[PDB]
Write an enzyme that holds these catalytic residues in place. Structure first.
Site, short mmCIF file in Angstrom:
data_model
loop_
_atom_site.label_atom_id
_atom_site.label_comp_id
_atom_site.label_asym_id
_atom_site.label_seq_id
_atom_site.Cartn_x
_atom_site.Cartn_y
_atom_site.Cartn_z
N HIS D 62 19.47 25.53 -80.95
CA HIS D 62 20.07 26.63 -80.20
C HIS D 62 20.84 27.57 -81.12
N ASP D 92 11.69 57.41 -96.78
CA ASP D 92 11.31 56.01 -96.70
C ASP D 92 12.53 55.20 -97.10
N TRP D 127 24.95 22.67 -86.63
CA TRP D 127 24.45 23.77 -87.46
C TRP D 127 25.13 23.85 -88.82
N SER D 157 15.20 36.47 -97.00
CA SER D 157 15.00 37.64 -96.16
C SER D 157 16.23 38.55 -96.19
N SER D 158 17.40 37.99 -95.91
CA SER D 158 18.59 38.82 -95.79
C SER D 158 19.05 39.35 -97.14
N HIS D 241 32.43 32.16 -92.75
CA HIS D 241 33.28 33.23 -92.15
C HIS D 241 32.69 34.62 -92.46
N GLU D 243 29.89 35.44 -92.70
CA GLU D 243 28.71 35.58 -91.81
C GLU D 243 29.13 36.14 -90.45
N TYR D 245 31.34 38.11 -89.68
CA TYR D 245 31.66 39.56 -89.83
C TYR D 245 30.37 40.28 -90.14
N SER D 256 30.73 52.93 -81.98
CA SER D 256 31.30 54.22 -82.33
C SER D 256 30.42 55.37 -81.86
N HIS D 290 40.33 27.86 -92.58
CA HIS D 290 41.01 27.75 -91.26
C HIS D 290 40.04 26.91 -90.45
N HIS D 291 38.98 26.53 -91.09
CA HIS D 291 37.89 25.75 -90.49
C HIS D 291 38.03 24.35 -91.04
N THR D 316 41.66 45.24 -87.47
CA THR D 316 40.81 45.19 -86.29
C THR D 316 41.48 45.88 -85.11
N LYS D 319 40.96 49.62 -85.10
CA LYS D 319 39.70 50.05 -84.52
C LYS D 319 39.71 49.98 -83.00
N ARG D 438 33.93 18.51 -78.29
CA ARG D 438 32.65 19.19 -78.33
C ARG D 438 31.57 18.33 -78.99
C1 HEA Z 1 24.32 34.30 -81.36
C2 HEA Z 1 25.17 33.38 -80.96
C3 HEA Z 1 25.16 32.64 -79.68
C4 HEA Z 1 24.79 33.03 -78.44
C5 HEA Z 1 24.25 34.36 -77.99
C6 HEA Z 1 24.99 31.90 -77.57
C7 HEA Z 1 24.72 31.88 -76.25
C8 HEA Z 1 25.01 30.85 -75.40
N1 HEA Z 1 25.54 29.63 -75.81
FE1 HEA Z 1 25.99 28.96 -77.61
N2 HEA Z 1 26.48 28.43 -79.39
C9 HEA Z 1 26.43 29.14 -80.55
C10 HEA Z 1 26.04 30.47 -80.57
C11 HEA Z 1 25.60 31.26 -79.54
N3 HEA Z 1 25.50 30.82 -78.27
C12 HEA Z 1 26.87 28.32 -81.71
C13 HEA Z 1 27.00 28.67 -83.21
C14 HEA Z 1 27.16 27.10 -81.18
C15 HEA Z 1 27.68 25.84 -81.88
C16 HEA Z 1 26.67 24.92 -82.43
C17 HEA Z 1 27.28 23.63 -82.81
O1 HEA Z 1 28.08 23.12 -82.01
O2 HEA Z 1 26.74 23.02 -83.74
C18 HEA Z 1 26.93 27.18 -79.78
C19 HEA Z 1 27.14 26.12 -78.94
C20 HEA Z 1 27.03 26.11 -77.58
C21 HEA Z 1 27.36 24.99 -76.72
C22 HEA Z 1 27.91 23.64 -77.23
C23 HEA Z 1 27.03 22.41 -77.04
C24 HEA Z 1 27.62 21.19 -77.72
O3 HEA Z 1 28.70 21.31 -78.31
O4 HEA Z 1 26.84 20.28 -78.02
C25 HEA Z 1 27.10 25.39 -75.44
C26 HEA Z 1 27.28 24.60 -74.34
O5 HEA Z 1 27.05 25.02 -73.25
C27 HEA Z 1 26.60 26.76 -75.55
C28 HEA Z 1 26.17 27.61 -74.52
C29 HEA Z 1 25.67 28.91 -74.65
C30 HEA Z 1 25.25 29.66 -73.50
C31 HEA Z 1 25.28 29.15 -72.10
C32 HEA Z 1 24.82 30.88 -73.92
C33 HEA Z 1 24.30 31.89 -72.90
O6 HEA Z 1 25.42 32.33 -72.10
C34 HEA Z 1 23.74 33.23 -73.33
C35 HEA Z 1 24.15 34.34 -72.38
C36 HEA Z 1 23.38 35.61 -72.62
C37 HEA Z 1 22.08 35.67 -72.91
C38 HEA Z 1 21.10 35.08 -71.94
C39 HEA Z 1 21.57 36.13 -74.23
C40 HEA Z 1 20.92 37.52 -74.30
C41 HEA Z 1 19.43 37.43 -74.43
C42 HEA Z 1 18.68 37.96 -75.41
C43 HEA Z 1 17.28 37.54 -75.84
C44 HEA Z 1 19.14 39.24 -75.97
C45 HEA Z 1 18.10 40.32 -76.01
C46 HEA Z 1 18.68 41.71 -76.26
C47 HEA Z 1 18.01 42.79 -76.70
C48 HEA Z 1 16.90 42.66 -77.67
C49 HEA Z 1 18.49 44.20 -76.49
N4 HEA Z 1 26.56 27.21 -76.86
C1 HEA Z 2 31.45 37.38 -84.00
C2 HEA Z 2 31.84 36.23 -84.46
C3 HEA Z 2 33.28 35.95 -84.67
C4 HEA Z 2 34.41 36.86 -84.81
C5 HEA Z 2 34.46 38.36 -84.80
C6 HEA Z 2 35.51 35.91 -84.96
C7 HEA Z 2 36.89 36.38 -85.16
C8 HEA Z 2 38.14 35.65 -85.40
N1 HEA Z 2 38.14 34.29 -85.41
FE1 HEA Z 2 36.47 32.98 -85.13
N2 HEA Z 2 34.81 31.69 -84.94
C9 HEA Z 2 33.52 32.01 -84.77
C10 HEA Z 2 33.05 33.40 -84.68
C11 HEA Z 2 33.85 34.62 -84.75
N3 HEA Z 2 35.17 34.62 -84.93
C12 HEA Z 2 32.58 30.88 -84.66
C13 HEA Z 2 31.09 30.87 -84.49
C14 HEA Z 2 33.50 29.75 -84.79
C15 HEA Z 2 33.20 28.29 -84.75
C16 HEA Z 2 32.36 27.88 -85.91
C17 HEA Z 2 31.90 26.49 -85.67
O1 HEA Z 2 32.73 25.60 -85.71
O2 HEA Z 2 30.72 26.28 -85.46
C18 HEA Z 2 34.80 30.35 -84.96
C19 HEA Z 2 36.00 29.54 -85.09
C20 HEA Z 2 37.28 30.07 -85.51
C21 HEA Z 2 38.29 29.28 -86.21
C22 HEA Z 2 38.19 27.86 -86.67
C23 HEA Z 2 38.86 27.06 -85.56
C24 HEA Z 2 38.33 25.67 -85.52
O3 HEA Z 2 37.16 25.45 -85.79
O4 HEA Z 2 39.08 24.77 -85.25
C25 HEA Z 2 39.42 30.20 -86.39
C26 HEA Z 2 40.65 29.81 -87.09
O5 HEA Z 2 41.63 30.49 -87.21
C27 HEA Z 2 39.03 31.49 -85.82
C28 HEA Z 2 39.92 32.64 -85.74
C29 HEA Z 2 39.44 34.02 -85.66
C30 HEA Z 2 40.35 35.17 -85.81
C31 HEA Z 2 41.83 35.27 -86.06
C32 HEA Z 2 39.46 36.31 -85.63
C33 HEA Z 2 40.00 37.71 -85.71
O6 HEA Z 2 39.13 38.57 -86.42
C34 HEA Z 2 40.22 38.34 -84.35
C35 HEA Z 2 40.98 39.66 -84.44
C36 HEA Z 2 40.81 40.49 -83.19
C37 HEA Z 2 41.84 40.74 -82.38
C38 HEA Z 2 43.16 40.14 -82.73
C39 HEA Z 2 41.66 41.56 -81.13
C40 HEA Z 2 42.21 42.99 -81.10
C41 HEA Z 2 43.53 43.17 -81.80
C42 HEA Z 2 44.52 43.93 -81.36
C43 HEA Z 2 44.34 44.68 -80.08
C44 HEA Z 2 45.77 44.03 -82.19
C45 HEA Z 2 47.07 43.64 -81.51
C46 HEA Z 2 47.22 42.15 -81.58
C47 HEA Z 2 48.31 41.46 -81.93
C48 HEA Z 2 49.59 42.09 -82.35
C49 HEA Z 2 48.21 39.98 -81.92
N4 HEA Z 2 37.74 31.43 -85.09
CU LIG Z 3 36.33 31.76 -89.45
#
Ligand code: HEA
Ligand code: HEA
Ligand SMILES: [Cu+2]
Ligand SMILES: CCCCCCCCCCCCCCCCCC(=O)OC[C@H](COP(=O)([O-])OCC(O)COP(=O)([O-])OC[C@@H](COC(=O)CCCCCCCCCCCCCCCCC)OC(=O)CCCCCCCCCCCCCCCCC)OC(=O)CCCCCCCCCCCCCCCCC
Ligand SMILES: CCCCCCCCCCCCCCCC(=O)OC[C@H](COP(=O)(O)OCCN)OC(=O)CCCCCCCCCCCCCCC
Ligand SMILES: CCCCCCCCCCCCCCCC(=O)OC[C@H](COP(=O)(O)OCCN)OC(=O)CCCCCCCCCCCCCCC
Ligand SMILES: CCCCCCCCCCCCCCCC(=O)OC[C@H](COP(=O)(O)OCCN)OC(=O)CCCCCCCCCCCCCCC
Ligand SMILES: CCCCCCCCCCCCCCCC(=O)OC[C@H](COP(=O)(O)OCCN)OC(=O)CCCCCCCCCCCCCCC
Ligand SMILES: CCCCCCCCCCCCCCCC(=O)OC[C@H](COP(=O)(O)OCCN)OC(=O)CCCCCCCCCCCCCCC
Ligand SMILES: CCCCCCCCCCCCCCCC(=O)OC[C@H](COP(=O)(O)OCCN)OC(=O)CCCCCCCCCCCCCCC
Ligand SMILES: CCCCCCCCCCCCCCCC(=O)OC[C@H](COP(=O)(O)OCCN)OC(=O)CCCCCCCCCCCCCCC
Ligand SMILES: CCCCCCCCCCCCCCCC(=O)OC[C@H](COP(=O)(O)OCCN)OC(=O)CCCCCCCCCCCCCCC
Ligand SMILES: [Ca+2]
Ligand SMILES: [Zn+2]
Lengths: 120, 51, 269, 534, 59, 113, 102
Positions: D62, D92, D127, D157-158, D241, D243, D245, D256, D290-291, D316, D319, D438
């Protein structure tokens, strides 16, 4: 029958863009073995002429329907990005004058006319 | 290389002037995508002896 | 040249490449390589004959891709000033990425050595491990490499100046100096008292210096390609881009080896 | 026909192949998340017959499909390859044959990951693929090898595509366009291309070293030879991380353009938007541990990473306030792309505020492997990056294709995914704060309540995806009719107040980028005489 | 010897694809395509055993 | 035939810029001579004598190690030092040969007992 | 941009006198109503006399319609209709409420 061109005025297609090969025992020169578009760009450099156009848009004034700004093109159209009379006065606005219709900027009122020079 | 221009010319699949309806291609293509997780489950549940 | 004649030539300097089969043929060889190696590492295929074939087809399919870039620049004239500048910039971004691959291997070395694990003896190197001494065959190698970055400098400047014999001799020497480095590491390997199996020390050591070994074999293949092209009059005194990319390569590999020799040989021993 | 689509050197044709593969992959990754949510509906064995290895296999499949085979080939491989050369005047890309190999490695990486789930028992590792669970003692056979080779092929690829994006932007701009004059979407693909170039090579070191432990008798991470499992996590998260971003910034540039078009106002403080995108891309290399807050690092190491993680909230938030400043005092037009952009501003803020709590190392003791984390990253990835992907398709596809879509059908689709996504992920925070781990197929009985609610919303959102598949069919069969009847929107900008209907027909388009000035399906030879700006 | 100019006129007046214009190109392209087919088909003919868990008897 | 077909496409040539370009092809041609000639001198007065004395010093040190290899080749496997826990790791046999030897394995110096 | 209100009127008065067709009168009028201010009565009078010179009645009707959107109260709309009384009467311009009465 065909022969290597010596200057830009002697170029007649791509068969006059093939040079004379270097003789045995020496390092070849650019003028001895360049061809094609790379050789045409070199003949212009030697005379002092830029064969690829790279100048920006003329923003000296604001064109009018009586006295527009002439734009040259080798097709029936060209894209134009207007930002105002002193460049940078207003947000850019892209336009497309054609051989049958002029272009006017909804922001500043500048008028651009086309001037086709291409030959099929 | 010179290609054609128009509406249905910049895509790799044929939509018009075909014998078979385009619905069989459109939804058959997205059905096979939705169906690969279930093929995997079938193979693995047939290995554990659940079936 | 009037307006009629200017119409027969491009209005921009950039290169419009014709369709080719190579990009999708390289992808298939990459999948045939991936599927074969995993299947033979686990016994589903009896021997290494299918892995050999997949490496041979990944190799001869990149050659043909390189063969079509020679013709587009020597026989067609498609490499103008702007095309030349873009090629150089793409190569510098390639080596920056390859440099950070070594940066990940230097992290693994320092992680294992600054606070060594107790199953080693809490000592670096671990007990019982006899390491390679710096003032030895590795000191002949660091001189052989430094000596090739100055014979390649005078070959490049003899081609700009129009001297052919001097240019052709300062490249035939850079070739056999990188070849000598390669077989000197071969001797140093079949004589070492430890192996890649000998714990975490034999793993970080042979990974950092073994990757560098593979690049040198690629570096000696590039100087042989330039040798054929310079001897057969492809390179001109002002247009030689296949040569400058090779020159930048021999200088980065020189700096990387310098770092390997200071960390893996002088500090870590 | 064969040589137009197998031998291609045109950047528009290649971008269409990317989108075709990207959408075929979101089908599979959505089907896996549906099977996952059915097995979590109630306590006990439900549909998988107690096969816990199979449940773990579907979770890896998934995540890999959603990230590496949907969101990256569509936001970057698709929109980047199609709109970046057109927005700067390029004829191109640089390196057109490199541009083609970076697509054809993704089909080969899919027939490596799919055959990984069918061989022996699959890879039930997560993953992140931590050792020693992923070594040959705890995972025998060729399944984890075939998953590593799949990840290797997505990195080729990337990386190759990033080198091409960087050279094209720096070398092939049109007459008068300087780096201060680039459209904001071009800046977002340029900065993303640099993060990929400096983070992918560290991941290729980590997972190739994991392949060596399994098959070549090596001790990078094996504890009996002196190796250390905690080294792998440093190497994996140093790519991880950056990734996340690499997945949000291209969506920052899409948001925008959409917000400015449907406000009739230029982006507020456009120059400080580029500075913020660069600061977030730089601070994303200094925060990775932080992970790893609970693996036993020093207390002074943990206090540094707390403050480093928090300060990415300042750029952030600039923006976020900037986007609210351009729509203030506007003339808002509520077409379908504008609906997603307004939902992005509300749902991305929520997901980012739960990240600020996670940023403190003291509080992360109660937030490790907790559903609370799963709730954080589905708000910023599925109501974030996914919502910006819908906003893009509805914004540019009528031009790219020459075919209009049913407008009122598209507003039903938007409301069905907005309602259904909130139902899945909002109760995930309640489960986590009460202490639910989880990566489990089964749980104690006190967690049954919110787990039933989330499984219902999973059916609502899959129905919204099936409506989107029909909207694609209707646009491709009835797209020309959607222009003459009143079933679709023709102009994304309407006449100004004092501008009459016939004066408006002199200049229908008022655009600050080139792409809306081309023919509807853009010509295969788009520029002969270069475009010129002042 | 020098053959840049002579090959320059052969290449620029040819209708064939780029990888076919040199007179010597038949000797490379014919055997490569046959070898390329074996190297792609044969690994695919082994996935049935891998799913079924049958290992080669190299013993 | 349009009326514009026979009119100039560039404009007046710049004879000043034609000379700056022309003078820069001779400055670099000779500056490469005063630069190339030094690096031949360096390659024969520093680089070559370095690969001279280092080689014999390396031959001497390598010649000694060959006898030390000859003595070990006579040592029977009874008094070979016992391996530590981290030495000769075999998580699973190598998939080539006998499954116990590496690529550059040398029986004189590497042994598994 | 530091332009005082007095400089605003003296610049758009000059800009309405130079407009030479309908496109120019509508483009200048659009930019004049796009600031954070209501144009002075002497600017509205020059915009009515510019649409008369290009012979377009709907543009003169829309002038007063934009005026009733931009003011803050309905007593600010009235005081404008009481200043521009002669001009709306001399040129024969009706109000949009008077033309489509409800
Ligand atoms: C791209 C990132 C992404 C997206 C979109 C989703 C979408 C969803 N994810 Fe998941 N998820 C992850 C990234 C993502 N997830 C990751 C990294 C983990 C952790 C893996 C790990 O634990 O090892 C995770 C884990 C995770 C778990 C944890 C399972 C466990 O811990 O064992 C669950 C449980 O319900 C879950 C649920 C869902 C659900 C219900 C949706 C659905 O809600 C989706 C809702 C919306 C859609 C249906 C998608 C849109 C459809 C498209 C095809 C887009 C097409 C668009 C155009 C081309 C214009 N996700
Ligand atoms: C699109 C993907 C995406 C983005 C953008 C982010 C954004 C951020 N993430 Fe996240 N993160 C994930 C994807 C993402 N993350 C995934 C996939 C995991 C789990 C990985 C795994 O275990 O599989 C994860 C897990 C993860 C962890 C590890 C936790 C754990 O595993 O136990 C942490 C730790 O600090 C973190 C923090 C943050 C913070 C601080 C931001 C910040 O950038 C957010 C900043 C944004 C705002 C703050 C909002 C707007 C701000 C304002 C309006 C300003 C005013 C606010 C104040 C004064 C407070 N997230
Ligand atoms: Cu992170
Ligand atoms: C071996 C390498 C392949 C090259 C030779 C093969 C074929 C020979 C052709 C014979 C025909 C003939 O008369 O040719 C004359 C021909 C005359 O050409 P010409 O008159 O100048 O013009 C003809 C055209 O230019 C074009 O000429 P053409 O069209 O006639 O062909 C030129 C050449 C294509 O030209 C190229 O562009 C060749 C470029 C190849 C690059 C080599 C790099 C890779 C090899 C390195 C190996 C290991 C690297 C791994 C990296 C490390 C990472 C792990 O052709 C090919 O090689 C085509 C591919 C072969 C067929 C593939 C299918 C197999 C079935 C048959 O000249 C040549 O033979 C040129 C060949 C190129 C020489 C390259 C030198 C190699 C570099 C040195 C290697 C040392 C490295 C070792 C490391 C040290 C460690 C100890
Ligand atoms: C199965 C039918 C066989 C019929 C038998 C032939 C008898 C005559 C019938 C005539 C039909 C000829 C069949 C040829 C095959 C065919 O036309 O449709 C068959 C094609 C398959 O082929 P493919 O080329 O796409 O490759 C792919 C093969 N794996 O389905 C499809 O892709 C359906 C795909 C539609 C979904 C894509 C939607 C994306 C829209 C573009 C938007 C892009 C936005 C970009 C933004 C960056
Ligand atoms: C995708 C990006 C790539 C990232 C790569 C990160 C990690 C790479 C580091 C390892 C590179 C190969 C090391 C050199 C071989 C070596 O190890 O030297 C050889 C060692 C030393 O001989 P010995 O042990 O017998 O001792 C000598 C006592 N007499 O023998 C072995 O190992 C035998 C095992 C063979 C190892 C081959 C492994 C190949 C897999 C990786 C392929 C290369 C990666 C891609 C490079 C383009
Ligand atoms: C097992 C299989 C492994 C296969 C890998 C083989 C690698 C061996 C290296 C062979 C390189 C030959 C290139 C010559 C082509 C040429 O002709 O370049 C010369 C051309 C022509 O310009 P000119 O100046 O000659 O003009 C002549 C006068 N007008 O300019 C260029 O194109 C410059 C670009 C060259 C870059 C080549 C690619 C280098 C990186 C490839 C790395 C691939 C492996 C990476 C693994 C981590
Ligand atoms: C598993 C073992 C690892 C194998 C590595 C993966 C192998 C995939 C590629 C196979 C090589 C075929 C040659 C293609 C390259 C080429 O031809 O570069 C040549 C291109 C051709 O430009 P053009 O034709 O597009 O434009 C037409 C203009 N004439 O010059 C450039 O771009 C300039 C910049 C050079 C950068 C090349 C980078 C090298 C590619 C390998 C990168 C791998 C990174 C990951 C490292 C592990
Ligand atoms: C852009 C490039 C960004 C470079 C990243 C450097 C920023 C480091 C800040 C945190 C340092 C710190 O403070 O780390 C403190 C911790 C302490 O660990 P400990 O608690 O176990 O100490 C307990 C003592 N017994 O050391 C580490 O973890 C090691 C991390 C070092 C980072 C190496 C990065 C190398 C980059 C290679 C990739 C190249 C591409
Ligand atoms: C304390 C934390 C505050 C956080 C606020 C975040 C709120 C986010 C919502 C933003 C929407 C409003 C957009 C800003 C309005 C604007 O456009 O302001 C810009 C306009 C343009 O002035 P000018 O260019 O014409 O003249 C030149 C001016 N130097 O000047 C104003 O109007 C002044 C606004 C008042 C100042 C704020 C006081 C706060 C107390
Ligand atoms: C469930 C089906 C229920 C039937 C509803 C009938 C709609 C009434 C009507 O006929 O509505 C007419 C509209 C036209 O819209 P209109 O504006 O022209 O008419 C309104 C006048 N004011 O067509 C539709 O809505 C079609 C609705 C289709 C719904 C989804 C179809 C199936 C999608 C899932 C299958 C694809 C996934 C498969 C791949 C895995
Ligand atoms: C799909 C693979 C096609 C790659 C392109 C190619 O294989 O090329 C196509 C070449 C020749 O066609 P040509 O493009 O060289 O032109 C030639 C103009 N006279 O035939 C082949 O190779 C046949 C190879 C058999 C394919 C079986 C394996 C398929 C996997
Ligand atoms: Ca259950
Ligand atoms: Zn303007």
């Amino acid at each position: 029958v065909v022969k290597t061109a010596q200057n830009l005025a002697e170029v007649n297609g791509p068969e006059t863009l093939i040079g004379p090969g270097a003789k045995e025992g020496t390092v070849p020169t650019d003028l001895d073995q360049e061809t094609g578009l790379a050789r045409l760009e070199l003949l212009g450099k030697l005379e002092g002429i830029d064969v690829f156009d790279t100048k920006p848009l003329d923003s000296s004034r604001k064109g009018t329907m009586k006295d527009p700004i002439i734009i040259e093109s080798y097709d029936d159209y060209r894209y134009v990005g207007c930002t105002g009379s002193p460049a940078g006065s207003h947000t850019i606005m892209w336009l497309k004058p054609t051989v049958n219709e002029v272009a006017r900027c909804w922001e500043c009122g500048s008028v651009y006319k086309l001037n086709p020079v291409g030959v099929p | 290389v010179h290609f054609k221009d128009g509406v249905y010319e910049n895509i790799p699949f044929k939509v018009k002037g075909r014998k078979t309806p385009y619905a069989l291609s459109h939804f058959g293509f997205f059905a096979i995508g939705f169906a690969v997780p279930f093929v995997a489950c079938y193979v693995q549940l047939k290995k554990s002896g659940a079936f | 040249m009037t307006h009629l004649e200017r119409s027969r030539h491009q209005q921009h300097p950039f290169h419009m490449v014709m369709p080719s089969p190579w990009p999708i043929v390289v992808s298939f060889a990459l999948l045939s390589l991936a599927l074969s190696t995993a299947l033979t590492m686990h016994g589903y295929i009896g021997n290494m004959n299918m892995v050999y074939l997949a490496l041979f087809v990944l190799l001869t399919s990149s050659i043909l891709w390189f063969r079509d870039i020679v013709a587009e620049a020597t026989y067609l004239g498609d490499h103008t000033m702007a095309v030349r500048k873009g090629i150089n910039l793409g190569f510098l971004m390639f080596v920056l990425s390859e440099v950070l691959i070594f940066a990940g291997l230097f992290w693994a070395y320092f992680h294992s050595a600054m606070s060594p694990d107790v199953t080693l003896g809490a000592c670096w190197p671990p007990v019982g491990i006899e390491a390679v001494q710096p003032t030895e065959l590795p000191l002949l190698n660091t001189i052989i490499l430094l000596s090739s970055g100055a014979t390649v400098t005078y070959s490049h400047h003899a081609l700009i100046a129009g001297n052919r014999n001097k240019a052709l001799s300062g490249l035939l020497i850079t070739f056999w100096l990188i070849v000598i480095f390669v077989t000197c590491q071969y001797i140093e390997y079949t004589n070492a008292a430890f192996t890649i199996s000998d714990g975490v020390y034999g793993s970080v050591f042979y990974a950092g210096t073994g990757l560098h070994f593979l690049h040198m074999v690629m570096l000696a293949a590039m100087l042989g390609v330039n040798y054929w092209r310079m001897r057969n009059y492809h390179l001109t005194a002002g247009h030689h881009v296949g040569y400058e990319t090779t020159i930048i390569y021999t200088h980065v590999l020189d700096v990387i080896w310098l770092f390997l020799y200071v960390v893996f040989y002088w500090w870590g021993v | 026909m064969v040589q137009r689509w197998l031998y291609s050197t045109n950047a528009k044709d290649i971008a269409v192949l990317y989108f075709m593969l990207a959408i075929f992959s979101g089908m599979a990754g959505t089907a896996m998340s549906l099977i996952i949510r059915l097995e979590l509906a109630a306590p006990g064995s439900q549909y998988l017959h107690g096969n816990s290895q199979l449940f773990n296999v579907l979770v890896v499949g998934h995540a890999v499909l959603m990230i590496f085979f949907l969101v990256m080939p569509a936001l970057i491989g698709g929109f980047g390859n199609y709109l970046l050369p057109l927005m700067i005047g390029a004829t191109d890309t640089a390196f057109p044959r490199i541009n083609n190999i970076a697509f054809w490695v993704l089909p080969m990486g899919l027939v490596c990951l799919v055959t990984s789930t069918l061989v022996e028992s699959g890879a039930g590792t997560g993953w992140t693929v931590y050792p020693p669970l992923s070594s040959i003692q705890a995972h025998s056979g060729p399944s984890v090898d075939l998953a590593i080779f799949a990840l290797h092929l997505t990195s080729i690829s990337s990386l190759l595509g990033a080198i091409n994006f960087i050279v094209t932007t720096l070398n092939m701009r049109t007459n008068g366009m300087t780096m201060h004059k680039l459209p904001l979407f071009v800046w977002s693909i340029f900065i993303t291309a640099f993060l990929l170039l400096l983070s992918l090579p560290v991941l290729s070191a980590g997972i190739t070293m994991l392949l060596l432990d399994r098959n070549f008798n090596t001790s990078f991470f094996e504890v009996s030879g002196g190796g250390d499992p905690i080294l792998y996590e440093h190497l994996f998260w140093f790519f991880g991380h950056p990734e996340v971003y690499i997945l949000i910034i291209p969506g920052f540039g899409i948001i925008s353009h959409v917000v400015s078009t449907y406000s009739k106002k230029p982006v507020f403080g456009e120059i400080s938007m580029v500075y913020a995108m660069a600061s977030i891309g730089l601070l994303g290399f200094l925060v990775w541990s932080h992970h790893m807050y609970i693996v036993g690092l020093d207390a002074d190491t943990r206090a540094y990473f707390t403050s480093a993680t928090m300060i990415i909230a300042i750029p952030t938030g600039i923006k976020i306030f900037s986007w609210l400043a351009t729509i203030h005092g506007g003339s808002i037009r509520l077409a379908t792309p504008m609906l997603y952009a307004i939902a992005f501003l509300f749902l991305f803020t929520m997901g980012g505020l739960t990240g600020v709590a996670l940023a403190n190392a003291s509080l992360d003791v109660a937030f490790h492997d907790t559903y609370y984390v799963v709730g954080h990253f589905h708000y910023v990835l599925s109501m974030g990056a996914i919502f910006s992907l819908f906003a893009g398709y509805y914004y540019w596809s009528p031009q790219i294709l020459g075919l209009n879509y049913n407008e009122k059908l598209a507003q039903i689709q938007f409301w069905l995914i907005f309602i259904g996504a909130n139902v899945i992920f909002f109760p995930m925070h309640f489960l986590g704060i009460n202490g639910m781990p989880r990566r489990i197929p089964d749980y104690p009985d006190a967690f049954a309540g919110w787990n039933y609610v989330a499984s219902i919303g999973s059916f609502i959102a899959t129905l919204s995806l099936f409506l989107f598949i029909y909207i694609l069919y209707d646009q491709l069969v009835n797209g020309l009719n959607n222009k003459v009847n009143n079933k679709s929107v023709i102009y994304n900008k309407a006449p100004d107040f004092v501008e009459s209907n016939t004066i408006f027909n002199l200049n229908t388009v008022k655009s600050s980028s080139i792409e809306f000035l081309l023919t509807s399906p853009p010509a295969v030879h788009s520029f002969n005489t270069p475009a010129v700006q002042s | 010897a020098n053959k840049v100019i002579q090959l320059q006129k052969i290449f620029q007046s040819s209708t064939k694809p780029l990888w076919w214009r040199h007179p010597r190109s038949a000797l490379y392209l014919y055997p490569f395509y046959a070898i390329f087919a074996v190297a792609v088909v044969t690994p695919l003919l082994y996935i049935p055993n891998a799913i079924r868990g049958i290992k080669a008897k190299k013993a | 035939l349009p009326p514009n077909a026979l009119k100039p496409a560039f404009g007046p040539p710049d004879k000043v810029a034609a000379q700056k370009f022309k003078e820069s092809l001779m400055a670099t041609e000779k500056h490469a001579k005063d630069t190339s000639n030094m690096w031949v001198k360096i390659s024969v007065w520093v680089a070559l004598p370095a690969i001279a004395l280092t080689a014999v010093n390396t031959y001497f040190v390598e010649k000694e190690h060959a006898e030390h290899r000859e003595h070990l080749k006579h040592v029977p496997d009874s008094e070979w030092p016992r391996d530590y826990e981290f030495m000769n790791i075999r998580s699973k046999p190598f998939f080539w040969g006998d499954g116990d030897k590496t690529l550059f394995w040398n029986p004189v110096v590497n042994r598994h007992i | 941009d530091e332009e005082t209100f007095e400089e605003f009127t003296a610049r758009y008065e000059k800009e309405f006198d130079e407009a030479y067709d309908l496109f120019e009168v509508q483009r200048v009028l659009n930019n004049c109503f796009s600031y954070d201010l209501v144009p002075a009565p002497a600017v509205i009078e020059k915009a009515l006399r510019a649409a008369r010179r290009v012979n377009d009645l709907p543009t003169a009707i829309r002038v007063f319609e934009a005026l009733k959107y931009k003011v803050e109260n309905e007593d600010q709309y009235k005081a404008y209709l009481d200043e521009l009384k002669d001009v709306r009467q001399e040129l024969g311009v009706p109000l949009k409420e008077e033309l489509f009465p409800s």
